[PDB]
Design a protein around this ligand. Structure first.
Ligand SMILES: Cn1cc(O[C@@H]2O[C@H](CO)[C@H](O)[C@H](O)[C@H]2O)c2ccccc21
Ligand SMILES: Cn1cc(O[C@@H]2O[C@H](CO)[C@H](O)[C@H](O)[C@H]2O)c2ccccc21
Ligand SMILES: Cn1cc(O[C@@H]2O[C@H](CO)[C@H](O)[C@H](O)[C@H]2O)c2ccccc21
Ligand SMILES: Cn1cc(O[C@@H]2O[C@H](CO)[C@H](O)[C@H](O)[C@H]2O)c2ccccc21
Ligand code: CA
Ligand code: CA
Ligand code: CA
Ligand code: CA
Lengths: 121, 121, 121, 121
């Protein structure tokens, strides 16, 4: 299992120690408060009122937690995943990333605390 | 396992199929959007800007997800619990509840989607 | 044989210890009172006056008891099954489920008590 | 081996001449263009931007190729499966099916061309 923090201001995101292999069932729980710029902060689902101005993940709100598995496209995580299995041909290290527009992470603040484990299967 | 929704306006909470027993390890993942009154909505961590005006759980924000185990006091759940073990002598059915002031649930809106399961132990 | 309860509010239903195998003859008796939202309660046949708005089982009323056998589609149970044999090929654990529209189980209440046994064949 | 077409508007799916037996290793390759309604068409992975509105297979995109083996639950095929073995207790005739919402196949168009063979073991 892996536990760590993902910084909102890190465009590169956080590479975890989890390698997702074919058939793996995983659980993720994410918590905390972060911002893509404003003084206010949002949880791991991000800001439901904010427009998509070129987010790294178009399937989640700005300020949401997302991930990549290997070099996959971004996949929404939000508050977490419950006994979840990845699509065909998706595999590799899990990287966690704050959802913002490339080049604009500099004014971000806060972080999410995240646990990831593999489940019985 | 239990999968369902917890209505923000449900003052009595949602009694699940999970009977928490000593030694049990559980995982909860919660998602979605709800309100204690305003037209805005907040995630399962609730509204971090809101004052505590007599909440059922003083250890979580207004609008957060909390729980009771049997007749325990309220325990914060927020976005979820990752392979969590209860305090000594805590046991019984898990009831999920939206965190608001008793007598004020009637104007609430929305719900959280929640999964709970028992983990290997 | 198996005896237990299934909650109206549980989208995941109740996984029983009964494994239905090809050729098996089974009997189920279900009883009790539950609701898909209204203050009134209905028995295991559900509410014959209610429209189907996207139920997990289109072959039974909203509020009815249904089941899956392994990864099958939903199968109506209602008040029960008398010395019943499945449609060809179906096999695996019996999961009992309350018939409602996915995502709308939040306002459900009550439960059904259910007995299942294998018969001679 | 088997080669044939799967029509997007065929809700029942195409039953192939392949009987999957315990221990079998199979390869599937699928190609072509189909739609679940729009004038555009998508390949066998379907439309990655489309919401799941009650698909017969929740583990693939709308417009993806999926299959059943015997009476199994749906299994994603997408572009194909390379030297693949089925889950425990899955066996029987392979039926190929376009992934759409039940009752909504009538406005579908196009087809996938599919090859299936058994591999050495
Ligand atoms: C429309 N709009 C943008 C914004 O803050 C910026 O959001 C972009 C991403 O959409 C980026 O993260 C920038 O670094 C942010 O400054 C807003 C704040 C308040 C209201 C409307 C906003
Ligand atoms: C201070 N304040 C309260 C409120 O809405 C009420 O919140 C209480 C709980 O604190 C209760 O749920 C009531 O039902 C709500 O009406 C506010 C809304 C906007 C700004 C300040 C508020
Ligand atoms: C039309 N209609 C629906 C309803 O209750 C809702 O029913 C759906 C399922 O169809 C779902 O369970 C909801 O959670 C229920 O609130 C009604 C009640 C009274 C009259 C008409 C209704
Ligand atoms: C949201 N949405 C649906 C759609 O076409 C329908 O898709 C459903 C399946 O989700 C079904 O196959 C229907 O027969 C289709 O008409 C859309 C087309 C364009 C944009 C958004 C759509
Ligand atoms: Ca920013
Ligand atoms: Ca309120
Ligand atoms: Ca309901
Ligand atoms: Ca269609």
């Amino acid at each position: 299992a892996w536990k760590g923090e993902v910084l909102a201001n890190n465009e590169a995101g956080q590479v975890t120690s989890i390698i997702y292999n074919p058939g793996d069932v995983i659980t993720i729980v994410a918590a905390g408060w972060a911002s893509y710029g404003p003084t206010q902060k949002w949880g791991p689902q991000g800001d439901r009122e904010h427009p998509d101005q070129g987010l790294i993940c178009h399937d989640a709100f700005c300020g949401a937690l997302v991930m990549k598995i290997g070099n996959s496209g971004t996949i929404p995580v939000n508050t977490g995943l419950f006994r979840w299995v990845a699509p065909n041909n998706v595999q590799g290290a899990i990287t966690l990333i704050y959802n913002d527009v490339p080049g604009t992470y500099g004014n971000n603040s806060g972080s999410f605390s995240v646990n990831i484990g593999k489940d019985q299967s």
